[PDB]
Amino acid sequence: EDMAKIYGAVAAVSKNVNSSVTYEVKRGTHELIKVPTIPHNLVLIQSDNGK
Amino acid sequence: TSGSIINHANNLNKVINHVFADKPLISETMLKILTIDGTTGKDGYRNWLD
Numbered sequence A: 001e002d003m004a005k006i007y008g009a010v011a012a013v014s015k016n017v018n019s020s021v022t023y024e025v026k027r028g029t030h031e032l033i034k035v036p037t038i039p040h041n042l043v044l045i046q047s048d049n050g051k
Numbered sequence B: 001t002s003g004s005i006i007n008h009a010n011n012l013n014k015v016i017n018h019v020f021a022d023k024p025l026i027s028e029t030m031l032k033i034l035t036i037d038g039t040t041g042k043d044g045y046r047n048w049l050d
Helices: A002-015 B002-019 B028-035 B042-049
Strands: none
Touching: A002 B002, B002 B042, B028 B042
């Protein structure tokens, strides 16, 4: 029974090692909006008689 | 190294926790010697194991 207890203690320590890590890298990634209409900012002015 | 200190502390906590689950590995005769000072009994074995 004592040997069973000791081996369980040692086995638990041996399992405490760590395999790896995982993470997502996203810094600097910004979303893009979409612009439907091109701004022209033009106005046509005409005389009343069209001169 | 701090790596050794951290690794030793966590590993020893697992050993102490395991040996006191179900039937304790150490007998009640030995626990009484370590408990006289005032420790709970888990700490006495932990201190002795160090």
